[PDB]
Design a protein around this ligand. Structure first.
Ligand SMILES: [Mg+2]
Lengths: 165, 165, 368, 346, 249, 63
DNA sequence: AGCTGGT
DNA sequence: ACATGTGTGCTAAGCGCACCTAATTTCCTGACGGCAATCCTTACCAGCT
C-alpha cells in the first residue's frame, strides 16, 4: 500500500508469476487458468485476491513473457519520472500513481489474451492510458499557452518501457 | 458573422487623418480626446441598427487603435497563430525560439485591455517579417470571446498545428 | 492568545525569490496567476534582520565539529568529535541540526574535550543537542530532529524533540494578475577582442507586484515553548514587528534594490485568524483615478466591512490598526470607519500590541 | 401493474464493495451489487442492523433484477490513514480505499407491483441518510427518478427508460453493458459457460455472512429501445443584462415624464433639455420606473457618454447628483464646446 | 426533514490533504481532474478542537453525519515548490539542506451534509431541544476552522463566502451543478461564477421546501432577479442559527 | 553608516537601455507601464566614468 | 509477583 | 449608444491616389548542498510494582 522509492501501487499482480509456470511446470496447456496472490511482508497479511485468466496453450515467447513477469519495475519507473529535472529519489508525478490502478483494471480483463500474444501486446496495451493521461495533463498544466500544450503532449507520450530482468 | 465584416470594411475606408488621430491615442482611453471619441462613435454606432450581432466595444476600440498603428489588409485564413508559428519555424531552436515563443504565450493569460502592448510587440515582429495580410474579422471574433478557454486552446492548437507543419 | 499582522507591500521591479529555473514564484489563486514570495524566504530575512541580532540565537548547521574545533586554541578534537557525532545518530558531514549557538559552543566544548568516554560522550552530546531550546528563533520557526537508526548504537537514546512553530508566515500573494517580466542581460568582457561581444548572455526574470504579506503570532505557543518567562516573548514580538516593517528579502537586491516599505499594517486580536486573500479574489484592476495601493486597500476595507458585520465577532472585537503615516492612506474612504486606533508610527503600534499583551513597555523589555 | 422501479445511482463518488477486501486494501466492483442496493433499500425504509436479515432480505431474495451502465466511471484510490490511538499509542494504522468516480447506474427490480408500490414511496420521502453504498459518497441525482411502469421482460424494462445527457457536446457510450441475474427457464437448467459468479447475496447482515449468485452479461446498443433525453438547463451563468432598446412602446412615453417633471430644463448646467440619460443600470430598460432616468441636455449627456465609454463600461452609472463626478463632466463639456465638429456628425 | 449544508469555500494557495507522495488529493468528476480533500480529514477537523466543542453523538448507534469529498468547482491546479535550507555556518561551499520539493494547490470547494429527523432526535444525548442546539452549533461550526495541514509554512485559513442550508428531506448533492468545471470571465469572481452556477442549478430541479441562504452583508445574491431563487437573501452569524433553531424546535 | 542617494532625473527622448528586439526596457509598476533602465547599466556607467579612473582596478574578463 | 516497555 | 424637445423659416450635387522599402557577427556559466522515522516480534527479561 506504500508507494516507496522502488514501488508504485498498481493492482493485483497476476503478471508476476508467469515465468516459472509457463516455462517449468505444466507450461502451455488447455484449460482455464486461476491465479492466487497473497502478499505478506514478514508477519503482516496485506491483501488477497484472485484471477481467472485465459489460456489455451499456443506456445510461448520467452522474452515477452519475461518482460510480463515483472511490470511493477516498469510502472514504478514510469511513476518516478518527475515533471522536469534529473533527481533520482524525487517522488515524481503523484497523480500518475492515482490513474495507474484504473488503467491496470482496464488492461487486465483480457489478461490471458494479453498473455498469449495474439493481437494484444505491450505496445498496444498502453493505448488505453492516453485518456486518463490527457485529463491528468489538463489538471497539471492549466494554461492555454503553446508551451503548456507542448508539455501536455510530451506528458501524453509517457508509457511503461519494458525491462529485460 | 455578418456584423464584424462591416466594421472591418468601414475601418478600411478610414482616411489618413482619422487613423493618425487613432495612432496618437495608443494606450489612452477614448475619453481624454474629443475627436477620438467622435471617430469611434461614427464607426461604432451605425452597425448596431443594421445587423443584430456586433463585437464588444473595448475589442472594437483596441482593434481600431492597432489597425491604425499597423495598417494590414483583411484576408481570410491569416489568423495570428498561423503566421505566428510559421515565423517560429524560421528560427534557431536553441536561444531565439524560446524568446519569441514566450512573447507569443504572454497573450494567452491577459485580459482584453492590457493586450495592447503584447499585441503591439507580436505585430511588430510580424511587421519585421514583412507580413501584409491579417484576418481582422477572424482576430476580432476570437478576441470578443477571448474569455472562454476553448477558443484559447483552439488558437494554441492552431499554433501547434502550424508549427509541426 | 494569538496575534495577526497583515501587510500590503508594493515593490519595485525585483526578483526576491526564484525557483530552480529562476522564475519568480507563482500560484493559481482564484483562477488567475498571482505572484508569490515564499514564506521561508521572509522568515529567513526576518531572522537575519539587523534588529534581531540581540535575539538571533539559533544555528542550523551540519558542521558541528567545525564549530567545536574553532573554539580550541591547541586541543585538536575534530576526529574524536566527528566519531562522537557519527554515533550520535547523524550518519556521514552530517544532516542539518538546529540548536542554540552559544550554549552548544561553550558547553559542547566542555563536554567533548574530556577523555572520560566515547559512548556516553555521544549520548550526553545528543542530550545537550535535544535540550537546546533556550532560543526564541527555534521557538518561532520550529524544529524537530530525526537521527538515523542504522549508523548508531543500541545504547544511545533520543529524548522527545517536540518544538512547535509559534509563527505561520503566509506566502505573499499578489493583489492582481501576475505579469512576469523577462530581463535580458549581457556580461561585458572588460578586455577587448575581435568579436566585440558579451562574456555571458544570460536570463533573469523579475516581477513588479503589490504583495499581500501575511504573518501570524501564536503568543500562547510563543510562551509555551519559551518557558515561563514573558519578557523574552514581548521582546521577540517587538523585534519581529520592527524587522518585518524594516527588512526585505535578500534576493537579487544587489541588482534590484527594491527596499520599499509596507504601505499597510492590520493588527487584529482574536482567537480565529483570517487572511484577506478573499479581499482580492477579484483581481485589482486600476482605474485612472487613485493607484494600485489605494484600490487594493479599498478592496481590503470592503472585505473588512463584510467580515466585521457579516462575519462580525463582537464577542472579541477588532483592535484593527494601521500605519497610516499622518493619514496619507486612510482606510475608510466611503464607509469603513471601524479602524479604532489608526496611527502613523511603528513603535507606537509595537507598544500598543505589547500593551494588550500585558503590562509591558517598549524600552524596558528591550534588554533581554 | 408497474412492476419495476429504476434506481438512479449517480454522484461524484460511489463504491459497492467486491469480495477481495479483508485487509487494508478495500476494493469495489464495476456494478452495484445486490447488497449494495439492498443496503440503500433498508436505509430507505429507516431500519438497519439485524432487522434486515429477517423479512427484508428474504422478502425480495426470490426476485430477479438487472443493472445498466450509463457511463463506466474510472476507479480511484484514496489515501486513508487511521490514527488508531491518536486523534493505543501513536502508531498510525494504514489503508487504501477504492472509489468509482463519475459513474451513473440504473438498477431494475421486477416481478410484482405491490412491493414496488411500497418501494416507490420509499426513495424520496423516507430516509435514514441514504448514500451511494459508501457512507461518504453522496447521490448527486434524485434517486426517485425514472418513474415505474409495466415492461414485462428484463431487457424491455432496462431499455425502455430515457437516457440523460449533461452538456450538449458530450461523448455518449453507444453500448450500454447490462448485468442480469440468472433466469431458470426450466427446472434443471445449467448456467451458460460465460456467467461469472458474484458473491452478493446476504443471508444475515451483521456480521456479514454471504451466499453467491450467478451473473449473466448482456448488451444494449442505443436506438432500438433506449434513446437520449432532453437536456436543456443551461449550466452557463454569464450575468444577464439587456441592451439597445430605442423604443418598443414605452420609451417615447417615458422620456417626456422627466422632461417636463424638471420643467423642460437641464439639471447640471440648467438649459433647455433634449434627451434623457439612464442611471443605475440594474436593467438597461424595456420597462423603466420614473425615478431612475435623468432628463438632461445634449452637451452634458455627451459628456456623460464621454465618461461612460472611456474606462469601464460596467453596470454602475454616473448619477450627476452627488458632487464627486462634477469636475470631469464640466471639463469634458469644455472640450466638447471647443472641439465639436458638427459638420463631421454628432 | 433533513439538513443540507451546501457550502462553498475558497482557499488561498496552500496544501491541505496529502497523499503518500505529498500531492494534494484529487477526484474525478465531469470528465476532468479536480482537487480534493478527504471527507475523513475535514470530519476529524470538525472534531479534535475545543472551539467546536462549545458533541459525541454526531461523530462517534454509530454516528450522525454524511460529509462528502470536497469536489472542486473547477479543474485541479497542482503546483510545485522548491526549498533550500541554508547552512548558516560558513563552510568551503554554500547550501546545505534537503533541497527538496513541496507542492500545493488553491481551490474552491463544495460539500454536502445530512442530518435526518430521527438521526438527530435519537441522537438525543440528554435533551430533546439538543436536537436543535447541536444542529444550530453545526450550521456555522462547519465553517469555523479550516482543517489543518502545512499551515506553519502555508498559512491559509480563508473563511467561506457563500453558504447554503436547505431543509429539503430528499438527499441530493448539488454536485451536478459542477458537471462543467467553472471557467473565469473577467467581470465576475471565481466564487461569484461558482455561486452563479449553483444558482442556475437551483432554478432547475424544482420543476421536476425553501432556500435558506447565507451571504455576509448580502454581497452574493442567489440570482440577479427580484424573483429570488432562495427568497431568504439574509444572514448574520447566529441569526441563522436561531432561525434554524425555531425552524426545527 | 549606510549612505543612500536618491536621484530624480528628467531625461530627453532617449533609448538608454533595450531588450533583444530593440524595445526600451519596460516594467509594470503600480499596474501601469513604466519605462525602465537596468541597475547594471548605471552600475557600469559609474564604473566606466570620467572620475573613476583613479579608482579602477578590476577586470571581469574571459581572456 | 507479575507486568510492561524495551531488546 | 442620430432619430422625437419644430419653435415664422434650416439646400446640396459633383467629387477621396497611385509605389520602391526592412541588414546582420558573436556572444550564452561554471559548483555545492538533495532528510532522517514510521506505520508486526529471531520475544523474553529484568526494574520494580
Ligand atoms: Mg446639462
Amino acid at each position: 500500500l506504500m508507494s516507496n522509492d522502488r514501488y508504485t501501487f498498481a493492482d493485483r499482480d497476476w503478471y508476476s508469476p508467469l515465468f516459472s509456470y509457463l516455462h517449468a511446470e505444466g507450461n502451455s496447456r488447455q484449460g482455464k487458468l486461476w491465479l492466487v496472490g497473497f502478499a505478506s511482508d514478514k508477519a503482516k497479511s496485506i491483501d488477497i485476491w484472485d484471477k481467472i485468466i485465459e489460456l489455451e496453450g499456443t506456445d510461448t515467447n520467452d522474452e515477452l513473457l519475461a518482460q510480463l513477469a515483472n511490470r511493477a519495475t516498469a510502472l514504478n519507473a514510469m511513476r518516478k519520472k518527475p515533471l522536469r529535472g534529473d533527481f533520482k529519489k524525487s517522488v515524481g508525478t503523484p497523480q500518475i500513481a492515482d490513474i495507474i490502478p484504473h488503467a491496470e483494471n482496464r488492461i487486465a480483463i483480457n489478461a490471458g489474451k494479453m498473455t498469449e500474444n495474439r493481437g494484444y501486446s505491450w505496445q498496444d496495451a498502453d493505448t488505453e492510458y492516453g485518456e486518463l493521461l490527457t485529463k491528468v495533463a489538463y489538471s497539471l498544466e492549466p494554461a492555454q499557452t503553446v508551451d503548456a500544450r507542448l508539455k501536455r503532449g510530451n506528458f501524453i507520450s509517457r508509457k511503461p518501457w519494458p525491462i529485460i530482468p | 458573422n455578418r456584423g464584424t465584416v462591416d466594421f472591418i470594411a468601414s475601418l478600411e475606408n478610414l482616411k489618413e487623418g482619422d487613423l493618425g488621430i487613432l495612432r496618437k491615442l495608443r494606450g489612452a482611453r477614448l475619453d481624454e480626446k474629443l475627436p477620438g471619441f467622435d471617430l469611434f462613435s461614427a464607426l461604432w454606432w451605425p452597425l448596431r441598427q443594421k445587423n443584430q450581432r456586433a463585437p464588444k466595444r473595448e475589442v472594437a476600440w483596441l482593434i481600431a487603435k492597432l489597425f491604425a498603428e499597423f495598417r494590414f489588409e483583411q484576408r481570410e485564413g491569416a489568423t495570428l497563430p498561423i503566421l505566428m508559428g510559421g515565423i517560429c519555424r524560421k528560427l534557431e531552436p536553441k536561444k531565439e525560439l524560446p524568446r519569441v515563443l514566450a512573447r507569443f504565450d504572454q497573450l494567452a493569460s491577459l485580459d482584453i485591455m492590457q493586450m495592447e502592448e503584447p499585441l503591439s510587440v507580436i505585430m511588430g515582429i510580424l511587421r519585421k517579417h514583412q507580413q501584409v495580410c491579417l484576418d481582422w474579422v477572424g482576430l476580432t471574433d476570437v478576441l470578443s470571446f477571448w474569455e472562454q478557454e476553448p477558443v484559447k486552446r483552439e488558437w494554441s492548437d492552431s499554433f501547434i498545428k502550424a508549427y509541426k507543419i | 492568545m494569538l496575534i495577526e499582522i497583515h501587510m500590503i507591500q508594493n515593490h519595485s521591479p525585483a526578483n526576491l525569490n526564484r525557483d530552480d529555473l529562476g522564475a519568480p514564484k507563482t500560484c493559481y489563486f482564484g483562477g488567475v496567476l498571482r505572484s508569490r514570495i515564499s514564506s521561508q524566504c521572509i522568515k529567513r530575512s526576518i531572522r537575519t534582520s539587523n534588529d534581531f541580532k540581540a535575539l538571533l540565537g539559533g544555528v542550523r548547521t551540519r558542521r558541528l565539529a567545525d564549530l567545536i574545533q574553532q573554539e580550541a586554541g591547541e586541543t585538536e578534537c575534530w576526529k574524536k568529535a566527528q566519531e562522537i557525532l557519527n554515533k550520535c545518530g547523524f550518519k556521514n558531514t552530517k544532516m542539518l541540526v538546529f540548536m542554540s549557538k552559544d550554549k552548544i559552543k561553550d558547553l559542547a566544548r566542555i563536554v567533548l574535550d574530556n577523555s572520560l568516554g566515547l559512548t556516553e560522550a555521544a549520548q550526553q552530546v545528543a542530550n545537550v543537542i535535544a535540550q537546546a531550546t533556550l532560543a526564541p528563533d527555534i521557538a518561532l520557526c520550529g524544529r524537530m530532529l530525526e537521527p538515523n537508526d542504522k549508523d548508531k548504537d543500541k545504547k544511545v537514546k533520543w529524548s522527545n524533540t517536540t518544538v512547535e512553530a509559534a509563527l505561520q508566515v503566509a506566502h505573499a500573494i499578489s493583489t492582481h494578475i501576475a505579469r512576469p517580466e523577462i530581463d535580458y542581460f549581457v556580461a561585458a568582457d572588460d578586455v577587448p577582442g575581435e568579436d566585440a561581444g558579451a562574456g555571458h548572455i544570460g536570463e533573469s526574470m523579475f516581477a513588479s507586484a503589490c504583495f499581500y504579506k501575511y504573518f501570524s503570532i501564536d503568543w500562547e505557543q510563543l510562551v509555551k515553548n519559551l518557558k515561563g518567562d514573558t519578557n523574552l516573548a514581548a521582546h521577540t514580538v517587538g523585534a519581529f514587528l520592527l524587522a518585518a516593517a524594516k527588512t526585505n528579502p535578500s534576493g537579487k537586491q544587489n541588482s534590484f534594490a527594491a527596499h520599499n516599505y509596507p504601505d499597510g499594517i492590520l493588527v487584529e486580536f482574536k482567537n480565529s485568524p483570517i487572511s484577506y486573500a478573499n479581499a482580492f479574489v477579484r483581481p485589482v484592476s486600476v482605474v485612472k483615478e487613485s493607484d494600485l495601493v489605494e484600490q487594493s486597500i479599498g478592496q481590503l476595507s470592503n472585505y473588512v466591512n463584510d467580515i466585521r458585520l457579516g462575519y462580525y465577532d463582537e464577542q472579541s472585537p477588532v483592535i484593527g490598526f494601521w500605519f497610516s503615516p499622518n493619514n496619507r492612506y486612510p482606510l475608510g474612504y466611503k464607509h469603513s470607519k471601524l479602524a479604532s486606533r489608526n496611527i502613523g508610527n511603528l513603535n507606537e503600534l509595537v507598544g500598543a500590541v505589547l500593551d494588550y499583551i500585558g503590562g509591558f513597555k517598549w524600552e524596558e523589555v528591550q534588554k533581554s | 401493474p408497474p412492476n419495476t422501479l429504476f434506481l438512479r445511482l449517480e454522484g461524484a463518488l460511489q463504491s459497492w464493495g467486491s469480495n477481495e477486501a479483508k485487509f487494508a486494501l478495500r476494493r469495489t466492483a464495476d456494478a452495484p451489487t445486490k447488497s449494495g442496493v439492498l443496503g440503500l433499500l433498508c436505509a430507505a425504509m429507516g431500519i438497519g442492523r439485524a432487522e434486515a436479515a429477517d423479512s427484508w432480505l428474504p422478502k425480495l431474495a426470490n426476485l430477479r433484477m438487472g443493472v445498466r451502465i450509463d457511463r463506466p466511471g474510472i476507479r480511484w484510490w484514496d489515501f486513508h490513514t487511521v490514527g488508531a490511538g491518536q486523534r493505543t499509542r501513536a502508531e498510525t494504522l494504514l489503508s487504501r480505499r477504492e472509489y468509482l468516480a463519475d459513474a451513473s447506474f440504473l438498477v431494475a427490480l421486477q416481478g410484482e407491483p405491490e412491493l414496488v408500490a411500497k418501494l416507490s414511496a420509499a426513495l424520496a420521502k423516507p430516509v435514514w441518510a441514504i448514500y451511494l453504498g459508501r457512507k461518504s459518497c453522496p447521490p448527486s441525482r434524485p434517486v426517485c427518478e425514472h418513474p415505474p411502469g409495466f415492461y414485462n421482460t428484463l431487457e424491455e424494462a432496462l431499455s425502455a427508460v430515457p437516457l440523460q445527457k449533461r452538456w450538449h457536446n458530450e461523448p455518449l457510450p453507444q453500448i450500454l453493458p447490462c448485468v442480469m441475474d440468472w433466469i431458470p427457464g426450466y427446472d434443471g437448467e445449467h448456467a451458460p459457460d460465460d456467467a461469472e459468479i458474484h458473491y452478493d447475496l446476504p443471508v444475515s447482515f451483521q456480521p456479514p455472512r454471504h451466499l453467491p449468485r450467478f451473473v449473466i452479461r448482456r448488451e444494449l446498443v442505443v436506438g432500438e429501445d433506449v434513446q437520449v433525453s432532453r437536456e436543456t438547463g443551461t449550466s452557463v451563468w454569464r450575468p444577464k443584462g439587456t441592451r439597445a432598446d430605442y423604443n418598443n412602446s414605452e420609451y417615447k412615453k417615458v422620456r417626456a415624464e422627466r422632461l417636463v417633471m424638471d420643467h423642460a430644463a437641464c439639471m447640471v448646467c440648467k438649459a433647455p433639455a433634449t434627451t434623457v440619460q439612464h442611471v443605475n443600470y440594474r436593467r438597461a430598460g424595456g420597462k423603466e420606473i420614473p425615478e431612475d432616468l435623468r432628463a438632461l441636455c445634449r452637451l452634458c449627456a455627451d459628456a456623460c457618454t464621454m465618461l461612460e465609454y472611456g474606462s469601464g463600461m460596467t453596470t454602475n452609472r454616473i448619477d450627476p447628483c452627488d458632487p464627486i463626478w462634477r469636475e470631469r463632466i464640466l471639463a469634458k463639456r469644455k472640450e466638447i464646446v471647443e472641439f465639436r465638429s458638427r459638420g463631421q456628425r454628432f
